[PDB]
Every structure is written in structure tokens, then in C-alpha cells.
Design a protein around this motif. Sequence first.
Motif, PDB file in Angstrom:
ATOM      1  N   UNK A   1       9.675   9.269   1.209  1.00 33.75           N
ATOM      2  CA  UNK A   1       9.760  10.736   1.167  1.00 33.75           C
ATOM      3  C   UNK A   1      10.711  11.241   0.044  1.00 33.75           C
ATOM      4  N   UNK A   2      11.749  10.459  -0.376  1.00 35.86           N
ATOM      5  CA  UNK A   2      12.600  10.797  -1.441  1.00 35.86           C
ATOM      6  C   UNK A   2      13.145   9.557  -1.965  1.00 35.86           C
ATOM      7  N   UNK A   3      13.324   9.571  -3.270  1.00 41.69           N
ATOM      8  CA  UNK A   3      14.068   8.629  -4.065  1.00 41.69           C
ATOM      9  C   UNK A   3      15.078   9.327  -4.992  1.00 41.69           C
ATOM     10  N   UNK A   4      16.341   8.929  -4.903  1.00 43.20           N
ATOM     11  CA  UNK A   4      17.386   9.475  -5.761  1.00 43.20           C
ATOM     12  C   UNK A   4      18.130   8.381  -6.520  1.00 43.20           C
TER      13      UNK A   4
ATOM     14  N   UNK B   1       0.859  -1.173   0.000  1.00 41.80           N
ATOM     15  CA  UNK B   1       0.000   0.000   0.000  1.00 41.80           C
ATOM     16  C   UNK B   1       0.898   1.226   0.000  1.00 41.80           C
ATOM     17  N   UNK B   2       2.215   1.008  -0.069  1.00 42.87           N
ATOM     18  CA  UNK B   2       3.097   2.150  -0.243  1.00 42.87           C
ATOM     19  C   UNK B   2       3.420   2.433  -1.692  1.00 42.87           C
ATOM     20  N   UNK B   3       4.381   3.300  -1.903  1.00 37.30           N
ATOM     21  CA  UNK B   3       4.766   3.733  -3.233  1.00 37.30           C
ATOM     22  C   UNK B   3       5.291   2.564  -4.072  1.00 37.30           C
ATOM     23  N   UNK B   4       4.810   2.456  -5.298  1.00 33.94           N
ATOM     24  CA  UNK B   4       5.279   1.509  -6.260  1.00 33.94           C
ATOM     25  C   UNK B   4       5.892   2.238  -7.440  1.00 33.94           C
ATOM     26  N   UNK B   5       7.071   1.913  -7.864  1.00 37.01           N
ATOM     27  CA  UNK B   5       7.664   2.560  -9.011  1.00 37.01           C
ATOM     28  C   UNK B   5       8.115   1.547 -10.050  1.00 37.01           C
ATOM     29  N   UNK B   6       7.926   1.853 -11.324  1.00 36.96           N
ATOM     30  CA  UNK B   6       8.422   1.004 -12.382  1.00 36.96           C
ATOM     31  C   UNK B   6       9.193   1.761 -13.425  1.00 36.96           C
TER      32      UNK B   6
ATOM     33  N   UNK C   1       6.750   4.987   4.541  1.00 37.19           N
ATOM     34  CA  UNK C   1       6.235   6.076   3.706  1.00 37.19           C
ATOM     35  C   UNK C   1       7.411   6.792   3.047  1.00 37.19           C
TER      36      UNK C   1
END
Lengths: 133, 133
Positions: free
Chosen positions: B128-131, B1-6, B126
Motif C-alpha cells: 500500500x505504501x513504500x517510502x 504476484x505482488x508488487x515488484x520494484x527495481x 498487498x
Amino acid sequence: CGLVASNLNLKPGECLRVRGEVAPDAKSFVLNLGKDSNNLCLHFNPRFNAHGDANTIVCNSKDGGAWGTEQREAVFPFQPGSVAEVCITFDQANLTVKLPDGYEFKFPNRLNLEAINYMAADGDFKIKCVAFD
Amino acid sequence: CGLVASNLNLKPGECLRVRGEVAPDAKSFVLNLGKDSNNLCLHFNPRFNAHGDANTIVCNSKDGGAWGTEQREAVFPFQPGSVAEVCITFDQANLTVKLPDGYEFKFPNRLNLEAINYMAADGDFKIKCVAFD
Ligand SMILES: CC(=O)N[C@@H]1[C@@H](O)[C@H](O[C@@H]2O[C@H](CO)[C@H](O)[C@H](O)[C@H]2O)[C@@H](CO)O[C@@H]1O
Ligand SMILES: CC(=O)N[C@@H]1[C@@H](O)[C@H](O[C@@H]2O[C@H](CO)[C@H](O)[C@H](O)[C@H]2O)[C@@H](CO)O[C@@H]1O
């Protein structure tokens, strides 16, 4: 396609900061925000030379897969082959977009989104950093 | 239920940095990385009190839906209700995970992935940043 994120759960007042590299041969680049790929509160499309526009930012909404009425901005603080960054905040009536020259503009929240759950960059915008506050 | 990135397109030798808030009441949290949700090169699962473990990092792979052999770490620099950052890189032999306090460990690249394209957080982390670096 570039980076796609879902379940963002961005809420009114929170600032989304997106920074990436614009491809050197880019005719434009796109950052899409909304609920899903058919339901965009903000299609943010700086055009270097595309679809009849030279060095113009085109913004639109998309609702149920249908484009709304475009809005065009007056400044163009982007270059191919360089870092591009945008900062976005919203409430249920409007989004506020801040550009790297400090210029801010509003775009109406036509879907009356209470949360932004979807973000997608195109293949001409390589995301380097995303911060959800 | 958190952030999913593809479409992450993280290649060997690249670094992914993820910072998030661990939920105040969390019993564990999860960051998954791989090809897709059924093929994970790294299930990173710090457990405060979960599945029999206490204050232990459990890592695993998942291959066509099937969990591999768990690995447990010896250190635990996480607290419920605090911000946590991890950095991850890989090569053909191993992923390397760097933790908040500077500690690093390796986890084998069992799927022989040549790119990492998927990332997902659970509802207790949760983002807060992705780099990308
Ligand atoms: C001046 C004008 O109305 N021009 C439009 C084009 O902008 C438009 O191009 C599309 O625009 C959407 C956003 O509204 C997307 O960026 C899409 O990729 C573009 O192709 C075209 C097609 O709708 O119509 C006019 O020419
Ligand atoms: C102490 C012990 O061996 N515990 C294990 C649990 O680790 C294990 O739980 C699953 O572990 C995977 C990763 O390997 C995921 O984190 C999954 O969500 C957990 O349920 C369970 C089930 O295999 O078996 C023991 O309890």
C-alpha cells in the motif's frame, strides 16, 4: 533511470500518490504509467526547458511503442531541485491528474486500461514515497 | 504476484519502509530485497502455518539461486487480514529489520551488497505504501 514498479494492480477509483525530488539540473522529469514500457496510459512530462517547451507539462499516451497526440497543461507548479508530487486516479475512459497546487485535469485513457500495472520514473525524479491508497 | 520494484538504489544507512495488507487467508507472506530475483540479501517470510513453521518469521538469503542458512525470529507481530509495516536498513555487516511493535533484529549481509536495487512482494502481501528515508 529511476524507480520502476510492476504488478501494481491499480484499479479504477484508487488513488496513486507519488512524491519525489526533482534533480537540481533537470531539464524535465518523467513519470510513466501503464501496462509496460511500450504501453503507457500516461506519460507525464513536466518540462522546465526541453524539446521546445519552457515550464510546460506535456502528457501523452504510448500504444505498441508509438506516441499518441500530446496534451499540454496551463499551470506549472514544479521547480528543479524541489519536491514534486502528483496524484492520479482513473477509470476506463479517463485519467484524472491532481497537481500540488490543487489543479486537476483529465487525460483520455486511450488504451482503455482496466488496471495500471506499470510505473516508471526517470533519472530526474527520485521517488521518496508511493502510495497505492 | 505482488508488487515488484527495481532501480531502488537503496544505499547503506538509508531506510526503506513498506506497508501492506496481509491477505485474510494467508499462510505466510514474503518481502524479498536484493540485487535481483536470484540474489537476495533478505527473504523476509513471516509464516502463519507454512513449510513446517507456525507463527514464526523465517529469514534467508539467496545467492545465485541458492538459499542460505535460515534464521528464525522469536517474535511474531503479524495477523492474516491486517496491515503490516516493516522498516529495513543495512550496512556492510547486517541488515536491520524493524517490526510493527518496535522490535528490531539483524540479519547478516551475506552477499556483501553495497546497494539494494530490487524488491518484490508475494501475492499474500498487498503493498500500500513504500517510502525511502
Ligand atoms: C510541439 C510538439 O509536438 N513537440 C513534439 C515534442 O514534444 C516531441 O518530443 C518527445 O515527446 C514525447 C511525448 O510525446 C516524449 O516526451 C519524448 O521524450 C520527446 O522527445 C518531439 C519528438 O516526438 O516531436 C515534437 O517536437
Ligand atoms: C521447518 C523447516 O526447516 N522448514 C524448511 C522450509 O523452511 C523450507 O522452505 C523454503 O524456505 C525458503 C527460505 O529458506 C523459502 O521460504 C522457500 O519458499 C521455502 O520453500 C524447505 C525447503 O528448503 O525445507 C524445510 O521444509
